[PDB]
């Protein structure tokens, strides 16, 4: 696969965004609002879920 | 479940199966109860195998290669000792009565005291 990484971009389909990338986009104050979706993932300060 | 656009196959799929009341065709569902929806996706393909060892191979559109699995070309004892479901012996934590509700496993702890 170290050689074959052009074969991954041979396809024309995008990647789904992960939850941790879906958490970084929220600004500091509305993160506690119901407009956030990934609050049910956030459970512990020491462990991502 | 073989997914060609991502080149990822699937090996262990548990699925519930039933028949429609209106037509004799099959309906597949999740083991929770959710309807399995991969059959609409055209790029994917699926292979179903039954507890009585029948055989379906469904490309999208519900059309199915239908057969039985052949195993007469394999020896009995090799298949019997290579993999086999296991019947348990009685140890600490299980009931002497058969089919009773099991209590908690012994679970020796690296977190608590041994006591």
């Amino acid at each position: 696969a170290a050689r074959r990484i052009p074969h991954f971009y041979r396809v024309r389909r995008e990647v789904p965004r992960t939850v941790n990338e879906m958490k970084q986009d929220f600004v500091v104050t509305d993160f506690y609002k119901v407009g956030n979706i990934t609050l049910y993932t956030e459970l512990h300060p020491f462990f991502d879920f | 479940v073989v997914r060609c656009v991502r080149a990822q196959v699937d090996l262990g799929v548990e699925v519930r199966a039933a028949r429609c009341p209106r037509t004799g065709l099959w309906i597949v569902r999740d083991r929770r109860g959710r309807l399995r929806r991969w059959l609409s996706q055209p790029e994917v393909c699926v292979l179903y195998v039954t507890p009585d060892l029948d055989f379906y191979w469904v490309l999208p559109g519900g059309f199915a290669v239908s057969s039985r699995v052949t195993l007469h070309g394999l020896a009995q004892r090799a298949l019997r000792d290579r993999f086999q479901n296991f019947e348990a012996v009685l140890a600490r934590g299980m009931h002497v009565e058969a089919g009773r509700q099991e209590p908690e496993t012994p679970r020796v702890s690296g977190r608590r005291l041994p006591f």
Binding site: A1, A2, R3, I5, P6, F8, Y9, R10, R12, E14, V15, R17, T18, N20, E21, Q24, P45, F46, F47, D48 | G110, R111
Partner: protein, 421 residues
């Protein structure tokens, strides 16, 4: 006052006209010290001439290049401001590893680990720099994965130099045998390499750098096969005759970057040809499967931790124009994955960017391949690449990355507590 050296670092890393041979000399030397001593005055003339024609300071992409320059080239024969600049870069390294450590309370050790490797991840040998040139000293829990089984039998790691080892040169694409130049990295230069490749580089480039490698087995064989290299003594009538004698490719590579008024071109390419005896191997993507320390193992003890590093590869800041037929991009981390460079190198990645223009984001939102998609298992999560694309180019914005690498262990809580941090 390390500000103007960091300004020069920012203007030499974000510059689009980086000279091309800095990557090939980086993969050529592999940070091997006597190899650097052989090529010493060549790179001295190179950095002096290239700095005088253009205010960028070259070889800044590699940690190994700048540290060997500052340790061995420091005798003289250069204008002293450049040696001061390199000494300020290593002093910046020393300052941020003083910040990352706890100099107040680092007495003794625990479970045969020093306490400073428990509080911040810049000192643990489990975390690796993305651009590895030599194996470290400490591989206790570490599993190095080139293929299906990790390379725990230590007998598949050997390489000799200067002996004409012909089978390993035919096995430069063989993934299973590993070839290292038996200079095991100690702990402090492991810390400095982790600083340079984890922290300083994306903080200066705003995560616009990339990582690539060369197909040098088929690159040098039409680069040194001209008989001016082979029939060397133990010409120079005109520069055009040297140009046709050296071949077309070596002309625009080494036109003005190393040819001062005292040496001709064919002399300089002979001196760079001296260093080919340490050729190394192709680029590999290794996977580190080390678990955590014993403190953080107390929660989720079966948490394996995968971390993809590069071997014999080069951190790059631009697309090398004349090496696109012999190079290949490796975006393998949330740092060093610039979609512009990977678009410029390979065609299908450029096709993928032109069909999905929203993947031009430099903040780690670029899709990594499937063998690098363990972002929950990575040591450096998406907050880091989210932060580094918009951080300023300031020394405190450098040291803030080492600040965010403070570990969450109970002993790190004790240590940050007793220092009132």
């Amino acid at each position: 006052d390390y500000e103007e050296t960091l300004r020069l670092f920012k203007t030499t890393v974000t510059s689009p006209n980086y000279p091309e041979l800095c990557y090939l000399v980086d993969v050529l030397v592999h940070g091997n010290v006597d190899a650097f001593l052989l090529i010493r005055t060549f790179v001295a003339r190179c950095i002096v001439n290239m700095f005088h024609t253009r205010q960028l300071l070259v070889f800044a992409h590699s940690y190994a290049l700048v540290t060997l320059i500052a340790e061995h080239l420091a005798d003289g024969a250069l204008p002293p401001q450049l040696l001061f600049h390199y000494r300020n870069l290593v002093a910046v390294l020393r300052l941020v590893t003083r910040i990352s450590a706890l100099p107040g309370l680092n007495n003794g050790q625990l479970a045969e680990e020093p306490l400073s490797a428990y509080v911040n991840a810049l000192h643990d040998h489990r975390l690796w720099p993305p651009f590895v040139t030599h194996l470290p000293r400490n591989m206790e829990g570490v599993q190095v994965v080139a293929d299906r089984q990790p390379l725990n039998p230590a007998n598949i790691e050997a390489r000799h130099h200067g002996v004409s080892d012909v089978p390993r040169l035919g096995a430069m694409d063989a993934d299973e045998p590993l070839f290292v130049d038996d200079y095991r990295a100690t702990d402090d230069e492991w810390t400095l390499q982790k600083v340079f490749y984890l922290c300083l580089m994306p903080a200066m480039t705003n995560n616009r750098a990339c990582g690539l490698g060369l197909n040098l087995k088929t690159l040098l064989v039409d680069l040194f096969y001209r008989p001016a290299f082979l029939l060397m003594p133990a010409p120079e009538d005109s520069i055009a005759a040297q140009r046709q004698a050296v071949g077309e490719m070596l002309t625009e590579l080494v036109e003005d970057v190393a040819t001062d008024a005292h040496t001709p071109l064919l002399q300089a390419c002979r001196e760079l040809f001296l260093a080919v005896q340490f050729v190394g191997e192709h680029v590999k993507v290794l996977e580190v499967r080390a678990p955590l320390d014993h403190a953080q193992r107390q929660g989720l003890p079966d948490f394996i931790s995968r971390q993809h590093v590069l071997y014999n590869g080069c951190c790059v800041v631009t697309a090398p124009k004349t090496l696109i037929e012999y190079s290949l991009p490796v975006p393998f981390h949330r740092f060093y994955s610039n979609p512009t460079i990977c678009a410029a190198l390979s065609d299908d990645i450029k096709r993928y960017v032109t069909e999905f223009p929203h993947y031009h984001r430099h903040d780690g939102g670029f899709p990594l391949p499937t063998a690098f998609a363990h972002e929950y298992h990575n040591w450096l999560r998406s907050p880091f690449s989210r932060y580094s694309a918009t951080c300023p180019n300031v020394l405190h914005s450098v040291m803030t990355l080492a600040a965010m690498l403070y570990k969450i262990s109970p002993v790190s809580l004790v240590l940050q507590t007793k220092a009132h941090i």
